[PDB]
Design a protein around this ligand. Sequence first.
Ligand SMILES: Nc1nc2c(ncn2[C@@H]2O[C@H](COP(=O)(O)OP(=O)(O)NP(=O)(O)O)[C@@H](O)[C@H]2O)c(=O)[nH]1
Ligand SMILES: [Ca+2]
Ligand SMILES: [Ca+2]
Ligand SMILES: [Mg+2]
Ligand SMILES: [Mg+2]
Ligand code: NA
Length: 157
Amino acid sequence: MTEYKLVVVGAGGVGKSALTIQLIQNHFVDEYDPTIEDSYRKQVVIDGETCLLDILDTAGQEMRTGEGFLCVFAINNTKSFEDIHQYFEQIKRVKDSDDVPMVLVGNKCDLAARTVESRQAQDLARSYGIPYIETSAKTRQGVEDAFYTLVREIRQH
Ligand SMILES: Nc1nc2c(ncn2[C@@H]2O[C@H](COP(=O)(O)OP(=O)(O)NP(=O)(O)O)[C@@H](O)[C@H]2O)c(=O)[nH]1
Ligand SMILES: [Ca+2]
Ligand SMILES: [Ca+2]
Ligand SMILES: [Mg+2]
Ligand SMILES: [Mg+2]
Ligand code: NA
């Protein structure tokens, strides 16, 4: 069956691990344990196709193998949004391509201390020709949509 190699990237503390664990294990990780590098694998049916998701959860604290990249910032962390650009460039680097499957994810959308407005992230994603999706690893809002949207982007390339 098809295997989709997904890589989750973004600054430290934005919720990459919480998002992946909510998707794969269906619970919210409340504590903050910085990641070095972890992998998750799960067989799922996406749009009627049985497939294997292979998800690499990377370190944000200061790749070339992935088929699509989930680029995460937190909507209450303006710096993590400004850091997105640096990840967009590293991805071009490690893939040696200018047209990589990516999805921009604004996480922690359950929080009210918002400093990145939806329209600003929509504009960033627009400029790279990719979707913008907001998520909450805490409430599960948008979580499946973000990862499945990345699979649907990979299928387009
Ligand atoms: N309210 C809220 N908190 C969240 C959300 N996602 C993650 N968090 C919290 O933010 C903290 C950091 O989450 P974590 O997933 O470890 O971040 P990370 O991006 O994997 N960090 P690292 O790059 O160091 O591995 C944790 O306390 C976690 O509970 C979310 O959607 N909402
Ligand atoms: Ca594959
Ligand atoms: Ca918990
Ligand atoms: Mg982590
Ligand atoms: Mg502002
Ligand atoms: Na390269």
